A paper describes a structure:
The monomers are very similar and have an r.m.s.d. of ∼0.17 Å for main-chain atoms.
Residue numbers in the entry:
A (entry chain A), B (entry chain A), C (entry chain A), D (entry chain A): 2 to 490
């Protein structure tokens, strides 16, 4: 294989699993075997929890500034190793090197950097009740937290979940997607090199059954999961039924992008293209229902198709590429099935729509950037998250209509509008039922900005100050300075 | 029956159920039939949700100060009707009238009053990213929330769950315990009289199957449950598996009270007695493992037994009573079984230990205030929440020992210490794994103080500013004022 | 006189001064003597401070909710007495009854109501340093605060200064403007009737020399002053030189209103008219430099002049009036001098410009709503706050030009823009150097919104949560639980 | 001289003054001339302001994380250069090298480090008013701030004032004490080397007349001063009278240390010694009134005198020294005058009391660690800040007495108690009128802990999150999305 035998990371070192099982990860651009990975057993998860409990104690006994400095050093190492990590991530995911070099590690490190600086600002409250009694709260570490990653942003998700957990004094056991197991181990090495105590970031490997081992474990105080809605429901159910864990869920969406008749149409078309085809369409927040007001529909669609024809589909290892293969053959089968469904249900195929099989593309999982026009709300491609490069374009007449149809979904992750008008921009966004809202842009996710889903697109949030607060638990302390007045007298 | 036929409260009025089923509520002091209550059907819950969705829209369209004033009026009505509500609550629960007159409605109204004044202070954030772009958040209502009450504090729990929900602009569908269905309807009437729109506080009735209808309903954004750990696990699992609802769980405990050798022993004994026998021992936060340092053990136990002998066991309708019956025969059977278990496992019976059956007591569910000495950590009465008036007293030698044994539990609701020493008071409390901690007192739960469980004693919190914040969901809005830089160029 | 002999309010009652001096207040619409008012002596201010210190102790010893309820009752009394107070305020100020009935008491009570509900939410922090030591803060009352009011909003300013002071547990000694001494006494009566302890709101009377007695007094912890810039500088200097008091200053302005070429011009003209002639032009935040982009200048000026001709100038006691006299003859002389200055320096007189002297107007201090066109940045009427009904209209070519000229002032109180464009609205406001900024509106001052000046227009803020916080002082408490390590060993 | 000709630091380089004036700084241990320093003229201050305005614009245009990284680099350079800076600071101040090596730069860098990490967490608010209108605030830089340092902690004060100013996007012009002008220039060099733009930290030099130039300058938005009460009053008066600047004042104190009869007396004596003789008694927060309860008075005084006799008085360049000379001959004359006053007014001289003149001590400004017993509240040494190594010990009988006498002062900087009792520790501290309160310790000033004075000991605060917030000014923005309803219709 390219990268050899891979295993677990427990107690500050790589470690053999005890399952007797392995799984393979491939390069989806070529079919090359990247690595054979040992799968964690139930005993291994138990050992990862004992290791995390030990490391968490040492980590939490440090001052907040000592934790800050160690996380700041981890940032330095991620910045130094950006290009090496970006190549590994490109191989494992199939995403273009132009993306992994500029986004995945950069923004992963950005969030660790943000929380490293905030580690000193976790404060409880104090409030008097009367001269003789007052309350103060402590914001204590939860303890051992579990993170379960997705394959579309492997190391970035590892960074985003581990950063607030560690900055708040927790340990984290992280399980990457079995589709993309490699880069999370490099993050574990970097945390150790930066000075993170043994066990504070452990990595276990395997499929959803290993995820279930984490979600069910009685020694884990909180589980944070990123993935599909239906898997997230099983994770949350098990996390609650097993031991009443706290939970964060970052799930899929069918996010609406509303292009109004007073939108900058060049800006709108750029936005729609970014919102549908970045990372080969494999982004939870993608604006995959593109609502366009009738009077600008033709002019907008023309601009969209012109930009789509300029997408550079190619080998993800080529820095000129800005669109590569999907992450797996299962992904490809699903996306092509949706394209078949769209065609059969009468949507108009305006661009793409087929697997690329010429020359080197045959050895990979390549689906062309695809655009459907004249879509209807009752179509499968409009109702369901595809998680691939398929834009559905829908005409509308009025603002109330667009808002009603945008909201008529059980998803609620993101939403966005394009309009030059002050009143319309804010009033439309205020009525959209989504946790992540963009005006005249799309896709940026600053470390300061809490992100998460309404409805079935998630529970809780990531990033922002609030997420650091939610990696602590509140202890309320009432101090009685006066005489205790007997109740039974 | 005493109080007649009772039913549902939907859309601003009492309303018939459509199940064809009823259930009875009794006075546990006398066995008198209090009421026959119609049980909500699945259709009724659907109707309660449609009604709540309609009312929530009108409620949220008001200004925060308009909501504040209406909730302040509800407070006035609760204060005026304190004694009538207290009698009803005494009849339904069996708790002494001296408690329901002074605590249940008073502190229920206290929390509504607190949140009414804070309804105007729910603020998002704003943060710039660069001159051309900034983020602001909205804290929007969740929508329709569900509350599921327990029978030990029926109207107080209805107040504590509905107050932050309504103050944040939500509607709530509330289901009281089938053991104590009556007082929640009076709160619904008061909210309507105060000006709360139809559907903003609906009441449905029935057993845990009606609770499951709420927990599973796709139109409900959040479920808040108070009850036993094992039921809470089923609620949270269903709330997550059905539609990824937000959840709050306030569950049971086995909370430790640590009496140190430098405790004020009079104060410690008063505290231990309050912490074990208020509300006939039916309080989730009760300090039911009483750890006492060896050098003061004998002097402390003597003081405890002297106070226990002065408890006034009697009819709860008599204002001289400060200890009445348990809430049900099922409660009595369970508690007596635990007393049997304690005796068989070798704990020493120091007080009580038997059902009272003389004179009027035979018609009720009365168990004497019970104290066990010389207890061991491996005993059932020490390991498991009894939810009845049974104190377990445990000797210890050292501070580290007491803290280790106090923490060696899967419960984590409350904890407390009694000591005159500054350093010891805070350092011991900081090491105890509980969300609710008391120093030289017990049991007070100010509206300012967030309360909830560590470990399997809960998820999330009630009361405090934080709980108002957690009845909103965060919408992040990024405003791009500059040119959108194309990603696909 | 109309309202008779008036005096001081100290220790919960009206009280004679000991200066041997009085001053008269008149109705500026008629010249009628309203009242003869006893002026406080230095001994009286000393007595007001001793009285406030005593009342503050009782007030602060109450719970926050007890203070909340008493302030909520004060709100009820202000709402009930709205019309009686509005007539008194109209007589004393000359402002139209249509304003005092709808604005002055309503919004004064609004801010007391807001802070009454927030009185329970004043919280310190807690932060650990290490296992053996932690910090908590207390937010303690400042003690005795001084408020010095202006004559344009007498009772509203009394409400806005006293509300956060009292809600935070302080006492306040308030001195109204000698021009408008009457309504502050009614507020003192209402606070007493609502349950505020004696001395918690005292009223002293007189000119700026009595204000200086307050600013210099060593027993006063904070002074809050609203008035002109040059007086504010003397107040702040004396407040600091005497005893290092905390200070709030709400001073005058020359606030710019920028009407862009893509403004709704009807909206812009309505805004400009409100921003210049409400309260007969006597508002610190008025938009008295009206910048209009050249391409819409003529159309905008036409709309402005049409609205100005529809202003109903009349007796302020007539509810049909929406523009009455200025507050004093000194005001009139000053404003007419500015009109003379504008004419002499070459500004074009487009409306008004003269004293009204026909019929009843001769007995009052009436100056017509005045508009100058073709103004220049170097004109006196453009550079200096007039505090009267004089709009200066200035043409501009570019957005950078308007922003540069709007900012080229030592004032910095308010600013505003009118534009339909999303990007322009926010980017222009972000560059304007003012504390109070309005987009597509003007003049609303919600209780939630902190208001105050940049540059020489003020220090500190009023309203918003932040102002409640700034009526407390921070006490930091470090608790050492471990052994103190000797420094000298 | 030892360190040569020194001058100003403006626009990223050392720069000649234009006053034609210099002043000398000496080593107070030897009388050696350390440097001849050019004094800034009025033109130089004007130039420093123009330079700061230019640098502030570039600094504020960076992202918060870009500012964070540059300040983090400044921290690295301060840590690397700790020993070189410590020697310079020892030479200039006379404080022991054991102090400057371990405290001055360490804790100065600590606060820069703290604020560097928090630079990303400065957030405004957002609050809706109604569906059609909402408010958001911006926390904008003040602009150009002035810092005026004291000679007892020259570089630490430069760090503590410049850190929150720069982290919030301001520039600062700093003037060190003319007694200790050297180390502030090294900080300016370090900021430049770390990447701080030219003009963002400028240094001007001279006596109080140069301080007055800063306090009066119309281009400076805020002045922060640390020094004596009487100078602080003049600074605040001029800062307000000139242009209504915001102000922070950290002034002197006469802080009480209360040793109760249940204090750990070893701990109390260590604390009292630290609280009186660190930095040769030249600390604003020193506990210079030591109240001791009568029953432990003799035992406590014995312990104090035993520790005082073990103080190592010596050359500050010797690392074995922990007590050196005072900072100047003016300091020495003043302190000796107070010792004379204490003796004449009848206080009992228990230790020290004289200038050391043997051997090398004759060439320095050495006063022995001095202790007075049997002091009275009416003595000059008890009433007035000495700012030298003179402890006044006062007996008391009751807790109320100690608290009353501790509070009977116009100072209010710090206070502290020593007691093993939980109730007494908190209840006594809650009643003491001081901003900085210590329980069973003294002198630690964590970056998290806001510090400042009550009464005439200061205005505003330093350190803590609150101080970062107070280096911004609030801009409130109301966005009207609906139709503007005409007021004049
Ligand atoms: Na792979
Ligand atoms: Na019942
Ligand atoms: Na008047
Ligand atoms: Na010197």
């Amino acid at each position: 294989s390219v990268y050899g035998l891979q295993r677990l990371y427990i107690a500050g070192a790589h470690a053999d699993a005890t399952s007797g099982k392995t799984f393979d990860t491939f390069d989806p651009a070529t079919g090359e075997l990247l690595a054979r990975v040992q799968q964690a057993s139930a005993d291994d998860v138990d050992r990862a929890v004992a290791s995390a409990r030990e490391g968490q104690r040492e980590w939490a006994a440090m001052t907040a500034m000592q934790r800050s400095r160690i996380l700041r050093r981890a940032v330095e190492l991620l910045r130094e190793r950006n290009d090496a990590l970006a190549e590994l991530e490109m191989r494992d995911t199939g995403k273009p090197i132009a993306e992994t070099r500029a986004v995945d590690i950069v923004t992963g490190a950005d969030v660790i950097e943000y929380y490293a600086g905030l580690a000193t600002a976790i404060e409880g409250l104090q409030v008097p009740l009367r001269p003789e009694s007052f309350v103060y709260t402590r914001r204590e570490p939860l303890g051992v937290c579990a993170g379960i990653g997705a394959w579309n942003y492997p190391i970035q998700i590892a960074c985003w979940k581990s950063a607030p957990a560690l900055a708040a004094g927790n340990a984290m056991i992280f399980k990457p997607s079995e589709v993309t197991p490699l880069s999370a181990l490099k993050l574990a090495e970097i945390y150790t090199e930066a000075g993170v105590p043994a066990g504070v970031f452990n990595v276990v490997q395997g499929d959803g059954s290993v995820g279930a081992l984490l979600s069910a474990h009685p020694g884990i105080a909180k589980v944070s999961f990123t993935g599909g809605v239906e898997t997230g429901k099983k994770v949350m159910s098990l996390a609650g039924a097993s031991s009443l864990k706290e939970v964060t869920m970052e799930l899929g969406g069918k996010s609406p992008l509303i292009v109004f008749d007073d939108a900058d149409l060049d800006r709108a078309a750029d936005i729609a293209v970014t919102a549908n085809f970045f990372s080969a369409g494999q982004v939870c927040t993608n604006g995959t229902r593109v609502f366009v007001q009738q009077a600008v529909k033709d002019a907008f669609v023309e601009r969209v198709l012109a930009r789509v024809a300029r997408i550079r589909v190619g080998k993800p290892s080529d820095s000129d590429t800005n669109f590569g293969p999907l992450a797996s053959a299962a992904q490809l089968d699903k996306v092509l099935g949706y394209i078949d469904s769209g065609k059969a249900e009468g949507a108009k195929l305006l661009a793409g729509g087929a697997r690329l099989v010429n020359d080197h593309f045959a050895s990979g999982q390549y689906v062309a950037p695809t655009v459907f026009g004249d879509c209807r709300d009752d179509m499968r491609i409009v109702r369901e998250e595809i998680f691939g490069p398929v834009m559905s374009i829908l005409s509308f007449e009025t603002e109330d209509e667009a808002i009603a149809r945008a909201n008529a979904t059980d998803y609620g992750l993101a939403a966005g509008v394009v309009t030059e008008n002050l009143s319309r921009a804010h009033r439309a966004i205020h009525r959209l039922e989504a946790g992540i809202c963009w005006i005249n842009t799309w896709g940026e996710s600053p470390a300061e900005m809490p992100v998460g889903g309404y409805k079935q697109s998630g529970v809780g949030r990531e990033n922002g100050i609030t997420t650091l607060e939610h990696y602590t638990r509140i202890k309320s302390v009432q101090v009685e300075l006066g005489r205790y007045q007997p109740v039974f007298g």
